[PDB]
UniProtKB/Swiss-Prot annotation, chain B:
One of its GO terms (molecular function) is biotin binding. The biological function of streptavidin is not known. Forms a strong non-covalent specific complex with biotin (one molecule of biotin per subunit of streptavidin). It is found in: Secreted. The keyword Ribonucleoprotein does not apply. Belongs to the avidin/streptavidin family. This is Streptavidin. Biotin binds at residues 30, 41, 79, 95, 107. Homotetramer. The keyword Signal applies. The lineage of its organism: Bacteria, Bacillati, Actinomycetota, Actinomycetes, Kitasatosporales.
UniProtKB/Swiss-Prot annotation, chain D:
GO terms for molecular function: biotin binding. Biotin binds at residues 28, 39, 77, 93, 105. A motif (Cell attachment site) lies at residues 44-46. One of its GO terms (cellular component) is extracellular region. This is Streptavidin. The biological function of streptavidin is not known. Forms a strong non-covalent specific complex with biotin (one molecule of biotin per subunit of streptavidin). The lineage of its organism: Bacteria, Bacillati, Actinomycetota, Actinomycetes, Kitasatosporales.
C-alpha cells in the first residue's frame, strides 16, 4: 500500500516515486513510448491528509522530457488520485505539451489517461 | 536566460512566484491576488532548460496540491503548457484539477480548463 | 458496418447508433439500464472512409442531457475511435460542459475517458 | 441565440442552426472559404437552459472527411453559449485521429476555442 514505490502504467512505463511528509512527490520516470530514453526527473505534489470518507488521494506530477541523453522539447503532467484497494492503483489524466511556434500552438497538447499499478504489463 | 523566474498573473486573480533552476526544476508558490497566507500553496514542476532554437516555446508543467497549513480541498491541479518569450511574454497552459473521490464518483473527479499567465496585471494607486 | 448497433460502457450505460453512409451518427443513449426516463438523443459524425491499415475509425458524438423528463443543463461530447474485429471497442475521451454563470465558468467542464464494447457486460 | 455564423479566434467559420428539437446542424470551414476546407457538423444543445444567468450547454462534432480530403480524424467541441450584449460560445475540444491501439496514447489533441459573431480582431 501507499504512494511511495515503483509503479507501472498500462504500457509498461516505470514510475519510481517517493511521497514526502511535506506533500512532495519526487522520483524518476522511464517511458515505454515516445522520444524518450532512460530515466527522467519528476516532481509533484500530493494531499498528505486525505479525506477519511473512502475517497482517493489527489496528486499530480510533471516530467519534462529532457535528460542528459535526449530532449523532446515537451512535458507531461499527470493529474489523478491514488486508490487504496485490493490492488492499489493511481488513476490519472495527463496533458503533454510540446514547445511549438505560435502558428502550431493549436496542436501543442496531447491528452490521455494512464492507470498505474505496482505490477508491470507483459 | 529561460525568462521564467519571477511572478506571473493568470486571467482570474491568481499569482505565482516561481524559480526556474538550472537543473530544470520549477519551485515556488501559487496564491490569490489578495496574497494572504491562507491562499498560498506550494508548487513544484519541471521545464525544458534547453528549448529548441526554431522560435518554438519552452515546454513546462507544474502541480499544486490544494492543501496548506490552513485548508485542504483534497484536490490537485496540474498545469501543462509552454512559455512564449518576447514583447508579449506569456505562459499558455491547459490544466487538470483532480479531486479525491470514491470510485462511484470517479467519473466526476477531474475538471479541465486553460490559464494564460502574463508578467503584468492591472494595478492602480490607492 | 462496424459501428452500427448497440454499445455498452462499465457503468451501466447503453447506446444504440446507426452509422450512416454519409458519416452521420444518430441514436439514443440510455444512462441507466432499467430506466426509460434516462434515454437521450445522440448525434455525431464519423469517418465514413477509414483506413484499412490497422488504425481505428475516428468518430465523435454529443448528448445534451435534456429529454422530456429531466434536464441536467449539460452536454457530453465523446471523441474517439472505433476498433473493429472480433473484440470491437469504441475508445473515447469525453468532455462534459455544464451551463454556468461566468463566475463559475472555471469549473464548467469535466474530462474523462470511457470504453464501449459490443458485448453486453 | 445560437443559430448564426460564428468565428473562432483563428478565423474558422462555424455556420450553425439550432433546431427546435436540441439539434445542431451546419458546416465548419477555414477563413479562406474554399470548398475543400468545408465540413459537415452535427451536435446537440440544451433547448431549455436554466433561468439563473447560466449559459446554455452544447456540443458538436466534425469528422474531417469531405468530398475532397480525409484526415482520418474528428473534433468534438464541448461548451456553452453565453448570450447578451456580445454573444459568445466558449469551448474545450478534443481531436482524435485514427491510430493503432498501442499508439493510441498519441491519438488525441486537446484545446480551447472561443467563438463570436464577429471575426477575430
Amino acid at each position: 500500500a501507499g504512494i511511495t514505490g515503483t509503479w507501472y502504467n498500462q504500457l509498461g512505463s516505470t514510475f519510481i516515486v517517493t511521497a514526502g511528509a511535506d506533500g512532495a512527490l519526487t522520483g524518476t520516470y522511464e517511458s515505454a513510448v515516445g522520444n524518450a530514453e532512460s530515466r527522467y526527473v519528476l516532481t509533484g505534489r500530493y494531499d498528505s491528509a486525505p479525506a477519511t470518507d473512502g475517497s482517493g488521494t489527489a496528486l499530480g506530477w510533471t516530467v519534462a522530457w529532457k535528460n542528459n541523453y535526449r530532449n523532446a522539447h515537451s512535458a507531461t503532467t499527470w493529474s489523478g488520485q491514488y486508490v487504496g484497494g485490493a490492488e492499489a492503483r493511481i488513476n490519472t489524466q495527463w496533458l503533454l505539451t510540446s514547445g511549438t511556434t505560435e502558428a502550431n500552438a493549436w496542436k501543442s497538447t496531447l491528452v490521455g489517461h494512464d492507470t498505474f499499478t505496482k505490477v508491470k504489463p507483459s
